[PDB]
Design a protein around this motif. Structure first.
Motif, PDB file in Angstrom:
ATOM      1  N   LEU A 226      -0.072  -1.311  -7.328  1.00 53.23           N
ATOM      2  CA  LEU A 226       0.075  -0.326  -6.258  1.00 53.23           C
ATOM      3  C   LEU A 226      -0.003  -0.986  -4.886  1.00 53.23           C
ATOM      4  O   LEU A 226       0.843  -0.744  -4.022  1.00 53.23           O
ATOM      5  N   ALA A 227      -1.027  -1.812  -4.658  1.00 52.46           N
ATOM      6  CA  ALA A 227      -1.162  -2.445  -3.351  1.00 52.46           C
ATOM      7  C   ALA A 227       0.081  -3.256  -3.000  1.00 52.46           C
ATOM      8  O   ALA A 227       0.561  -3.201  -1.865  1.00 52.46           O
ATOM      9  N   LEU A 228       0.614  -4.016  -3.958  1.00 49.25           N
ATOM     10  CA  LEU A 228       1.793  -4.831  -3.672  1.00 49.25           C
ATOM     11  C   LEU A 228       2.976  -3.961  -3.270  1.00 49.25           C
ATOM     12  O   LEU A 228       3.661  -4.237  -2.278  1.00 49.25           O
ATOM     13  N   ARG A 229       3.241  -2.905  -4.039  1.00 49.38           N
ATOM     14  CA  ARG A 229       4.398  -2.068  -3.746  1.00 49.38           C
ATOM     15  C   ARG A 229       4.209  -1.317  -2.438  1.00 49.38           C
ATOM     16  O   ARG A 229       5.177  -1.092  -1.704  1.00 49.38           O
ATOM     17  N   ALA A 230       2.968  -0.949  -2.118  1.00 49.83           N
ATOM     18  CA  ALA A 230       2.704  -0.313  -0.836  1.00 49.83           C
ATOM     19  C   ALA A 230       2.996  -1.262   0.318  1.00 49.83           C
ATOM     20  O   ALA A 230       3.474  -0.839   1.374  1.00 49.83           O
ATOM     21  N   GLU A 231       2.716  -2.556   0.138  1.00 52.94           N
ATOM     22  CA  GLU A 231       3.073  -3.521   1.174  1.00 52.94           C
ATOM     23  C   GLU A 231       4.585  -3.657   1.294  1.00 52.94           C
ATOM     24  O   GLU A 231       5.121  -3.738   2.406  1.00 52.94           O
ATOM     25  N   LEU A 232       5.282  -3.714   0.156  1.00 48.65           N
ATOM     26  CA  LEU A 232       6.737  -3.789   0.168  1.00 48.65           C
ATOM     27  C   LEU A 232       7.337  -2.614   0.925  1.00 48.65           C
ATOM     28  O   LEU A 232       8.289  -2.780   1.698  1.00 48.65           O
ATOM     29  N   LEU A 233       6.783  -1.420   0.714  1.00 43.98           N
ATOM     30  CA  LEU A 233       7.241  -0.232   1.425  1.00 43.98           C
ATOM     31  C   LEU A 233       6.921  -0.330   2.907  1.00 43.98           C
ATOM     32  O   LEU A 233       7.780  -0.044   3.746  1.00 43.98           O
ATOM     33  N   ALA A 234       5.701  -0.751   3.253  1.00 40.45           N
ATOM     34  CA  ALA A 234       5.347  -0.886   4.659  1.00 40.45           C
ATOM     35  C   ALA A 234       6.298  -1.829   5.379  1.00 40.45           C
ATOM     36  O   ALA A 234       6.673  -1.584   6.526  1.00 40.45           O
TER      37      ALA A 234
END
Ligand SMILES: [Cl-]
Length: 214
Positions: A3-11
């Motif tokens: 989750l954290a990784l994909r949230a960074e990708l989105l940011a």
């Protein structure tokens, strides 16, 4: 999960319209600071708004008014362009209509340090009728404040981009602005103790909450 990784990708993707707006403002302030006359500036601004893309829909230069001018037609001198094919609008320059130097996006940048950027609230532009958010910054000439430059982000385009990107990454997202307004909410909800990943672009800047999509 990641989750954290994909949230960074989105940011990182949500940052693209932010960086885009800054870059276009830097071009606008270059034009405003220059010695180009009004007609040359209009040509360069028309070209600029012709080449910019993404969520950027309109903007321009807002010179400090000369409200003391006897001729009403000389007091306001904005150079504002709308991507409909780029149109220049003169509507802000009739003195009967109030002018532009009391708008919140102008006042936010008025006489502030060069290199500072300011967020407007969401609003519908009174002449283009496009719902938007505006980034503004001052520009100077001869060490003296000379005007404000603005770039307008289409809310509809920003929503489409953020939601489509979130969906591709199997995420739900809420994006709020510096005034607490929900700019985008796509497939976002919390139940069964789902984790939420929070990311702040700044204390008075965009905020995102990210969840996994099921
Ligand atoms: Cl939305």
């Amino acid at each position: 999960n990641n989750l954290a990784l994909r949230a960074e990708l989105l940011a990182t993707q949500i940052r693209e319209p932010l960086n885009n707006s800054i870059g276009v403002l830097q071009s606008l302030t270059s034009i405003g600071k220059s010695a180009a006359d009004k007609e040359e500036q209009e040509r360069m601004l028309r070209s600029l708004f012709s080449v910019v893309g993404g969520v950027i829909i309109s903007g321009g230069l807002w010179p400090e008014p000369n409200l003391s001018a006897t001729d009403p037609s000389l007091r306001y001198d904005s150079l504002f362009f709308n991507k409909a094919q780029v149109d220049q609008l003169s509507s802000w320059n009739n003195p009967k209509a109030g002018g532009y130097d009391r708008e919140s996006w102008y006042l936010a940048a008025e006489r502030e340090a060069e290199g500072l950027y300011f967020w407007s609230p969401v609003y519908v532009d009174p002449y283009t009728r496009v719902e938007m958010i505006t980034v503004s910054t001052p520009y100077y000439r001869n060490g003296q404040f000379a005007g404000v430059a603005t770039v307008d982000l289409s809310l509809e385009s920003l929503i489409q981009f953020v939601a489509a990107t979130a969906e591709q990454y199997n995420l739900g997202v809420n994006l709020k602005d510096a005034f607490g307004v929900e700019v985008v909410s796509h497939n976002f909800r919390t139940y069964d103790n789902a984790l939420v990943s929070y990311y702040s672009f700044g204390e008075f800047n965009w905020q995102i909450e990210v969840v996994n999509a099921n």
